[PDB]
Subunit: 68 residues, 12 copies
């Protein structure tokens, strides 16, 4: 009945959707009761060749197990 | 003499935020016939226990009120 | 008990944001009798190709929900 | 459901913002019963010339948009 | 005339945010007397070294200034 | 040098500019120091007959005199 | 298509609408496809005599044309 | 020169937002001694299919960062 | 060094990503030096046949040469 | 019953935003000894007509209400 | 009377004040009427060896001159 | 590449810059890939003697790794 909230950033060369999804799946590997991920910010990183990386910051909350 | 109402509406899709937006815009157009702009207010995802993702988006749209229509 | 609905409306005017706002409020009062305040949320101008300006203003108002009005 | 309606509503109470919010939610649930989350947008108090306080709260709620339901 | 001053004030209580607000509004009403609405701007808690909580709330109120009152 | 900041509301049946000018002139009654007023918020009161009052909240700042309260 | 966004400030002794109109016209003298100007901020400057100038900041967008720097 | 860690946590309770906030403070103090302020970030309510309400509240807390353990 | 910051809008019938990349590619035509573009706002234009245009407003910053 | 006033104040300095803030706080403390925290709200610079910069900073401070600081 | 508004970023190895001073002085090379610069955002770049650059984004306005 | 983002507060009697460098330095003890720190909030504490402590809240992000559990 008490949850930790954290922000994470996903990235992808394909889409904000895939960057988000990757980040949520990685989070689920280790905290395992994420129900909602809220989009906080979106941006793009760009290199000199013009390759774009889509980056997305998400807020996810998870039930804290009786631990520190 | 033109007064508009503004509402928020949410679309959802397994595919994308663009698809979730398009669903909500289509449903709004079935109710009113002068929507020209829909602004993105918030985006999120819902994740079910099996890890299936649904993309969700809240849009703000305005449309001209008809005389006598309720608030 | 008493519960209220809040909505956002946009008035428009070739003259002023005050006139656009008064038009929106008067239209609102044609439907509900209990509006005593209207908060300004946003203002803009639309411009056509001749340069004719329409002042536009988004207002938030609230009013009592009547039970015989479906949500 | 691919589309959800969103509305903002205000509840009031002489006793708590929690009561003001529960009343607003329960009144909305009378009309649409799949409301699962209500977000607090704004809180205030009205104070009458005797000093009597009314707690007021504005909530945003969403629910599946029905066929033939206005936006 | 009819110019108002707008100020923020914080009330505190071990019991609730509503009581902390009531304390602040009652205190303000004995100095300035035409306060009709108090808006909640921020809420927090102070926790002491023993773990006792003090709920604290920042409110915005406006009151009519006397014709000659300094700023 | 240190400046006090205050927020004030003016009102008018006619315009927000008048509402603002009224608030600003009242401020100028006890301080020759006001050079900018920022609009923070705008609304209208509407009475039962539907008469409108435009109201506007402004922020002003001015030098703190060594004997004034904050 | 791709567009440029800019903020501009108009001023007037008369009204925020006139300040805004004036800035918009100025903008339109250079580009023909401004369709909306969003109000971002309003303020007033006030001189030592208490004379008021209404000032308004607006955000406008227009199609960027080859003969146009960023 | 000291460094502090900042985290956000959410408490919940069927009773009130004050109680939801106290549950989250209690849980935080099980791990750290020196939380002294908890700022309210957001409040909402979750409503189950039976109409039962749970009050939820997101708090931001800071405390001394110790050389061990995570940023 | 000193950088200029500008806002630009890209549009696409396909996606906000395509609208953004269009806008960034065009910016890098006038100044190759852009490394990040932050999304500021997103919206859609909808015509009377219900055809959607996705639009996105980006902030970019670049080394001021001027020149 | 413990109620606090909140005010905004601005300090200025040709040297730094730190010195600007410190000047404001020191002036505030000349009147009210118990100010312990000041939050930065905004920073800017005023620039004169041959390039001299003045750093300015707006701070928010709170302190227990008292009749020598009416409001 | 009409004014142009722009955002600019300055950097410094030593302070946000100096980073700001630099951006303001660079703007003044091009325009004469700048009277206020508002701070929008502050950040720091940090290289792989731990060296810090203070960066600041300012908004400035000035009268827009003919053409 | 998935990153974690956290907020951290540095303090210093010297300046907000030095308070920021303190928090950045401390974070570098834990992770090595921090390249930018964004300022979120600034404040000061002041003691009864007028001694000031500058405080600054920074947001930083770094690639996820076992030693920095979520
Ligand atoms: Ca309560
Ligand atoms: Ca006007
Ligand atoms: Ca997409
Ligand atoms: Ca400094
Ligand atoms: Pt220790
Ligand atoms: Pt008093
Ligand atoms: Pt891990």
């Amino acid at each position: 009945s008490v949850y930790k909230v954290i922000d994470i950033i996903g990235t992808s060369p394909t889409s904000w959707e895939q960057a988000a999804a990757e980040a949520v799946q990685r989070a689920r590997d280790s905290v395992d009761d994420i129900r909602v991920a809220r989009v906080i910010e979106q941006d793009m990183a760009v290199d000199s060749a013009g390759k774009i990386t889509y980056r997305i910051k998400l807020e996810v909350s998870f039930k804290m197990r009786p631990s520190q």
